[PDB]
Scaffold this active site. Sequence first.
Site, PDB file in Angstrom:
ATOM      1  CG  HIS B  41      -8.263 -33.889  28.230  1.00 51.48           C
ATOM      2  ND1 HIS B  41      -8.956 -35.086  28.210  1.00 51.48           N
ATOM      3  CD2 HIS B  41      -8.766 -33.169  29.256  1.00 51.48           C
ATOM      4  CE1 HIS B  41      -9.889 -35.067  29.152  1.00 51.48           C
ATOM      5  NE2 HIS B  41      -9.807 -33.882  29.792  1.00 51.48           N
ATOM      6  N   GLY B 143     -16.286 -30.333  33.228  1.00 52.10           N
ATOM      7  CA  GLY B 143     -15.557 -30.105  34.473  1.00 52.10           C
ATOM      8  C   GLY B 143     -15.361 -31.392  35.249  1.00 52.10           C
ATOM      9  CB  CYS B 145     -12.100 -34.283  32.546  1.00 49.90           C
ATOM     10  SG  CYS B 145     -13.155 -34.645  31.115  1.00 49.90           S
TER      11      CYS B 145
HETATM   12  C1  LIG Z   1     -24.233 -27.509  24.960  1.00 48.96           C
HETATM   13  C2  LIG Z   1     -24.254 -28.732  25.861  1.00 48.96           C
HETATM   14  C3  LIG Z   1     -24.764 -29.955  25.122  1.00 48.96           C
HETATM   15  C4  LIG Z   1     -25.111 -28.534  27.118  1.00 48.96           C
HETATM   16  O1  LIG Z   1     -22.914 -28.983  26.311  1.00 48.96           O
HETATM   17  C5  LIG Z   1     -21.727 -29.324  25.551  1.00 48.96           C
HETATM   18  O2  LIG Z   1     -21.709 -29.427  24.324  1.00 48.96           O
HETATM   19  N1  LIG Z   1     -20.665 -29.452  26.337  1.00 48.96           N
HETATM   20  C6  LIG Z   1     -19.404 -29.591  25.913  1.00 48.96           C
HETATM   21  C7  LIG Z   1     -18.939 -29.637  24.598  1.00 48.96           C
HETATM   22  C8  LIG Z   1     -17.591 -29.793  24.314  1.00 48.96           C
HETATM   23  C9  LIG Z   1     -16.666 -29.905  25.337  1.00 48.96           C
HETATM   24  N2  LIG Z   1     -17.058 -29.863  26.624  1.00 48.96           N
HETATM   25  C10 LIG Z   1     -16.077 -29.949  27.722  1.00 48.96           C
HETATM   26  C11 LIG Z   1     -14.894 -28.993  27.516  1.00 48.96           C
HETATM   27  C12 LIG Z   1     -15.450 -27.561  27.526  1.00 48.96           C
HETATM   28  C13 LIG Z   1     -15.689 -26.943  26.145  1.00 48.96           C
HETATM   29  C14 LIG Z   1     -14.546 -26.427  27.026  1.00 48.96           C
HETATM   30  C15 LIG Z   1     -15.684 -31.382  28.012  1.00 48.96           C
HETATM   31  O3  LIG Z   1     -15.602 -32.263  27.153  1.00 48.96           O
HETATM   32  N3  LIG Z   1     -15.535 -31.503  29.342  1.00 48.96           N
HETATM   33  C16 LIG Z   1     -15.362 -32.652  30.191  1.00 48.96           C
HETATM   34  C17 LIG Z   1     -15.910 -34.047  29.847  1.00 48.96           C
HETATM   35  C18 LIG Z   1     -17.249 -34.270  29.129  1.00 48.96           C
HETATM   36  C19 LIG Z   1     -18.290 -33.147  28.984  1.00 48.96           C
HETATM   37  C20 LIG Z   1     -19.632 -33.892  28.934  1.00 48.96           C
HETATM   38  N4  LIG Z   1     -19.350 -35.184  29.560  1.00 48.96           N
HETATM   39  C21 LIG Z   1     -18.042 -35.398  29.745  1.00 48.96           C
HETATM   40  O4  LIG Z   1     -17.548 -36.379  30.282  1.00 48.96           O
HETATM   41  C22 LIG Z   1     -13.911 -32.691  30.717  1.00 48.96           C
HETATM   42  O5  LIG Z   1     -14.085 -32.194  32.053  1.00 48.96           O
HETATM   43  C23 LIG Z   1     -12.779 -31.927  30.033  1.00 48.96           C
HETATM   44  O6  LIG Z   1     -12.178 -31.053  30.654  1.00 48.96           O
HETATM   45  N5  LIG Z   1     -12.448 -32.299  28.786  1.00 48.96           N
HETATM   46  C24 LIG Z   1     -11.295 -31.741  28.063  1.00 48.96           C
HETATM   47  C25 LIG Z   1     -11.684 -30.864  26.896  1.00 48.96           C
HETATM   48  C26 LIG Z   1     -11.136 -29.583  26.761  1.00 48.96           C
HETATM   49  C27 LIG Z   1     -11.528 -28.806  25.664  1.00 48.96           C
HETATM   50  C28 LIG Z   1     -12.429 -29.310  24.706  1.00 48.96           C
HETATM   51  C29 LIG Z   1     -12.952 -30.594  24.838  1.00 48.96           C
HETATM   52  C30 LIG Z   1     -12.571 -31.376  25.939  1.00 48.96           C
HETATM   53  C31 LIG Z   1     -18.417 -29.685  26.993  1.00 48.96           C
HETATM   54  O7  LIG Z   1     -18.855 -29.617  28.175  1.00 48.96           O
END
Ligand SMILES: CC(C)(C)OC(=O)Nc1cccn([C@H](CC2CC2)C(=O)N[C@@H](C[C@@H]2CCNC2=O)[C@H](O)C(=O)NCc2ccccc2)c1=O
Lengths: 306, 306
Positions: B41, B143, B145
């Site tokens: 992803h 971050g 992941c």
């Molecule tokens: C507003 C608050 C509640 C404080 O935060 C979020 O909603 N956070 C997130 C909402 C949606 C996605 N994510 C990230 C991706 C960032 C938006 C671009 C996400 O899912 N990141 C992580 C894993 C998650 C975050 C929270 N706990 C986890 O284990 C991962 O590092 C990643 O890169 N995921 C791929 C991805 C890329 C784009 C969109 C979603 C997921 C978030 O951190």
Amino acid sequence: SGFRKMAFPSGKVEGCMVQVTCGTTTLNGLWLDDVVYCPRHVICTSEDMLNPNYEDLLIRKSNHNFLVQAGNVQLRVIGHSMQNCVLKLKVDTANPKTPKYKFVRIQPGQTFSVLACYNGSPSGVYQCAMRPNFTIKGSFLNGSCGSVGFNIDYDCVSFCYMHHMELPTGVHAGTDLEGNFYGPFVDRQTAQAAGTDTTITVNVLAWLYAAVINGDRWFLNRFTTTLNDFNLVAMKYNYEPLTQDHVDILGPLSAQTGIAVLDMCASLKELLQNGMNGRTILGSALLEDEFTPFDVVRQCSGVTFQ
Amino acid sequence: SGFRKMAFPSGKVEGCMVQVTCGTTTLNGLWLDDVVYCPRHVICTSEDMLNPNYEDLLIRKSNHNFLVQAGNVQLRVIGHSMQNCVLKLKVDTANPKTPKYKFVRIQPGQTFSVLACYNGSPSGVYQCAMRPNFTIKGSFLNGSCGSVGFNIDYDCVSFCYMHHMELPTGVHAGTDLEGNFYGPFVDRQTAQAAGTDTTITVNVLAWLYAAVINGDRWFLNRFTTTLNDFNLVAMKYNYEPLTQDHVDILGPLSAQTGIAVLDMCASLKELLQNGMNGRTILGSALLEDEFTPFDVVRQCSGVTFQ
Ligand SMILES: CC(C)(C)OC(=O)Nc1cccn([C@H](CC2CC2)C(=O)N[C@@H](C[C@@H]2CCNC2=O)[C@H](O)C(=O)NCc2ccccc2)c1=O
Ligand SMILES: CC(C)(C)OC(=O)Nc1cccn([C@H](CC2CC2)C(=O)N[C@@H](C[C@@H]2CCNC2=O)[C@H](O)C(=O)NCc2ccccc2)c1=O
Ligand SMILES: [Cl-]
């Protein structure tokens, strides 16, 4: 999200651990630059530990009586000195893996990571608090003496603890890296009182803020209190009195959550008087005091090192 | 003595972490030999994660669209392939810090250490269990992941987990290092049921043996039970059924303590029916299931690595 009792990544400390042998006794040392630090009781037999005269025992030892091994590498000892309860062995090679480091004496209620080691070899890493009574509730077996506690700030390892002993009550005592015991303890196998321990109030409040941030909100009540009223309750339950310095350190968590510190004190008050009524907070059935305010901020903001 | 939720020393894994950037998205990779492993992803925008066609998205990417950084060192990508839910980036440099390693798919109820990383940088290490429902209750923020779970056996790092996602319920899902999810999960931002979780009975029994070894004996009763009677109780409290394989794995702890496994089952039975009556076991107010029998033996025997 989620909240775990997280230790620092241990790699920078792993590279500093060595084995130290003197006569019959082997334990761990910490190799930084061209000095190896270890508990001075490395020079004792089991009989000596009953009532050691460290000055008289050390006078019998020469440089060549200290066997220091870094992995399968023998280090050459060119100097020895006693500083308080630690021995400093000067060696002819600077540790190439010496990280940026400092020696710190931590306050009661502060947290750190322990790297449990046997025969100079890392076995495990865990996070614990210096108790208000200057003990730690660790996991230490024979051979773990010389294992160290530490914090990391980016690239700087702050060593705060060296393991020296287990009290007859099964809790743990040791020194800063200048060899000064935390608490009233001595490096002698004798009965030693640790004295009344207390709960680290500011840490419990930090962990309640962590719970709220993670959506565990059930304990939030309709009440507030005063610093004095709360401290009446803290005294009764063997909690540390809360001060304005504690309130100030909690400020950033108050700000994010919108929960005035004194409102969170009223929640804590109700938990202390009523108990948890068979519920949990961040997967705990008791009030957790091994997270500092600084811990919660780091974890809840995902701060890194190298 | 003492008993702590201990993680493996993380140094061997710290040396393998890198940052991977593709378009807008950065997360962690694992650099072993001349391959970097990361969640596929990494190639998605926030919009893509709603309903990704990974094959169609990856076809738009060339080697030069994958930015891989090991500290301040840029790695050159000479190949990319998708294996299940992971990307494998071939790079022109073998990681000089590659430890002896294996890829393992762990069983539900098995434990491992997570090294939580952000932007390729280690922030913390903690020990957790693969739940019976193939989730983990971790601590992961944006971050994180690509952060990995692992066990160590002397000099061999067994990688078992790569972090992919947080379910809307706040628990964590990911893959083995061949990119196969644990459990029914997919790498899509959609509602996904984890299904009923259960308590890891053999782990709770191992931890009760650990408690006895450490002098916490209050829960030992005058009763015994049968495997069938105990499993009637386990079913009612959402505990995993105990099998003779579980009894066999507990044998060495039974032997040392002199407590027949079925006698310890009767103690566990009484705890499940009666609760803890406001007492603690090894400083916990609930029954702990994140220690395997193998964990208790290691800790209670102080087994080391390098
Ligand atoms: C507003 C608050 C509640 C404080 O935060 C979020 O909603 N956070 C997130 C909402 C949606 C996605 N994510 C990230 C991706 C960032 C938006 C671009 C996400 O899912 N990141 C992580 C894993 C998650 C975050 C929270 N706990 C986890 O284990 C991962 O590092 C990643 O890169 N995921 C791929 C991805 C890329 C784009 C969109 C979603 C997921 C978030 O951190
Ligand atoms: C029989 C059981 C209950 C299983 O074990 C012991 O009684 N163990 C010990 C009894 C007395 C001493 N020790 C060692 C020293 C060995 C006898 C030679 C000891 O105290 N070792 C540790 C620290 C302790 C052990 C348990 N938890 C700890 O933190 C330390 O590594 C060390 O080297 N201490 C110096 C020392 C040297 C000689 C005698 C006592 C202490 C023990 O391990
Ligand atoms: Cl608990």
